[PDB]
């Protein structure tokens, strides 16, 4: 069933997590390194690459930063596995871990630092699929033996789609992504898409609201550009962000219990091996 925006404040969300008795959670981060990032900054990052490093922070650095300031409490041990996808070394088939022997980022300061160190060494490629990053998350959950996890994907939302194709027929990248979201709902996993750049967002919204085959609504879309573009205080922007990111988490947590996913090994999850970071 679909999960609406049931909470109008961060406070309501924390109470809702309180009533549901959330005691433990961990984060997983995935980062879109596809070529489309070079042109989805046309309006919102002044015709620059969304991954372009400079004196100003790019939307990815901004999103990492706010995630660290608003969501760090939801990773119980401050160690965050981070993965990249869609560069020339992974295309639409694989992900790579930020560090060689899969070692984790200690805190989101290191996530930000490691991102900065990695990105200019990457050939941004494609095609764009969320299938590998979601399948990587699935493997992290299955290996922890059903420990509750939130996958945060920071991306520009431009999954390789058909066009024009009226049809209702899906590109392989889109179909595999939907298949992964469906399969993911056999595990105690929440997905939050932090959308950066110009969009368009119709497809992310469809992942958010309309996938009939999945066991429960396991996917939330946060339009990061739209929240940051508001004429509000920085403190109010972070609250709006945290509220958007967490909106579906209490019902999703509860759903993992009602559907008997939490703490349970599914036994039917392919083990995805991350590639090493393609760097020096
Ligand atoms: Ca962790
Ligand atoms: Ca949703
Ligand atoms: Ca939603």
* Spacing, Cα 56 to ligand 3 middle (Å): 30
**Resolution expressed in Å:** 2.4
As to burial, measured by CB atoms within 10 angstroms (0-12 exposed, 13-18 middle, 19+ buried), residue 29 is buried
* Spacing, Cα 129 to ligand 1 middle (Å): 24
* Spacing, Cα 121 to ligand 3 middle (Å): 34
**Domains, the chain, ranges and CATH?**
22-185+195-258 (3.40.50.410)
Q: Please tell me the distance from the alpha carbon of residue 252 to that of residue 167, in angstroms, as a whole number.
A: 32
How far is the CA of 211 from the CAs of 2, 29, 99, 185, 214, in angstroms?
9, 22, 33, 11, 6
Tokens coding 160: 């390789």
Q: How many residues does the chain have?
A: 280
* Spacing, Cα 141 to ligand 3 middle (Å): 22
- Going by their DSSP bridges, the two strands 149-155 and 96-97 should be labelled as unpaired
With residue 108 as reference, give the H or E element that holds it. helix 108-118
* Spacing, Cα 182 to ligand 1 middle (Å): 24
Q: What are phi and psi of 37, to 5 degrees?
A: -60, -20
Q: Is 129 helix (H, G, I), strand (E, B) or coil?
A: coil
Contacts of 8 (CB under 8 A, 6+ apart): none
Whether a cis peptide bond, with omega within 30° of 0, leads into 15 is no
- Going by their DSSP bridges, the two strands 79-80 and 105-106 should be labelled as antiparallel
CA 85 to chain centroid: 11
Q: Please tell me the distance from the alpha carbon of residue 65 to that of residue 186, in angstroms, as a whole number.
A: 31
CA 82 to chain centroid: 10
How far is the CA of 255 from the CAs of 173, 188, 273, in angstroms?
27, 8, 28
CB of 238 closer than 8 Å to CB of 265: no
Determined by X-ray
Q: Please tell me the distance from the alpha carbon of residue 207 to that of residue 205, in angstroms, as a whole number.
A: 5
* Spacing, Cα 152 to ligand 1 middle (Å): 12
Tokens coding 88: 């020339």
Tokens 């699929």, residue located: 129
């Amino acid at each position: 069933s679909k999960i609406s925006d049931n909470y109008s404040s961060l406070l309501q969300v924390s109470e809702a997590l309180g009533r549901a008795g959330l005691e433990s959670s961990n984060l997983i981060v995935g980062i879109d390194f596809t070529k489309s990032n070079e042109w989805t900054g046309a309006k919102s990052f002044n015709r620059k690459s969304l991954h372009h490093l400079s004196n100003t922070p790019n939307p990815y650095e901004q999103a990492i930063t706010i995630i660290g300031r608003t969501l760090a409490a939801f990773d119980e041990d401050n160690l965050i596995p981070c993965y990249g996808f869609g560069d020339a070394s992974t295309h639409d088939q694989d992900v790579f871990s930020f560090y060689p022997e899969g070692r984790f980022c200690n805190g989101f300061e290191e996530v930000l630092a490691r991102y900065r160190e990695i990105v200019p060494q990457l050939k941004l490629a494609g095609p764009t699929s969320f299938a590998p990053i979601i399948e990587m998350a699935m493997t992290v959950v299955e290996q922890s033996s059903g420990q509750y996890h939130v996958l945060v994907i920071i991306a520009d939302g431009q999954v390789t789609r058909s066009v024009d194709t009226e049809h209702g027929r899906l590109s392989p990248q889109e179909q595999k992504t939907v298949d992964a979201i469906v399969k993911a709902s056999t595990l105690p996993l929440s997905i939050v898409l932090v959308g950066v750049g110009d969009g368009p967002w119709d497809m992310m919204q469809e992942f958010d609201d309309n996938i009939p085959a999945r066991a429960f609504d396991n996917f939330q879309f946060v339009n990061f550009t739209e929240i940051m573009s508001k004429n509000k205080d920085q403190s109010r922007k972070e609250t709006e962000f945290a509220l958007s990111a967490l909106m579906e988490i209490p019902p999703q947590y509860k759903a993992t219990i009602e559907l008997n996913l939490l703490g349970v090994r599914n036994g039917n999850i392919p083990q995805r091996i991350p590639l090493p970071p393609p760097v020096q």
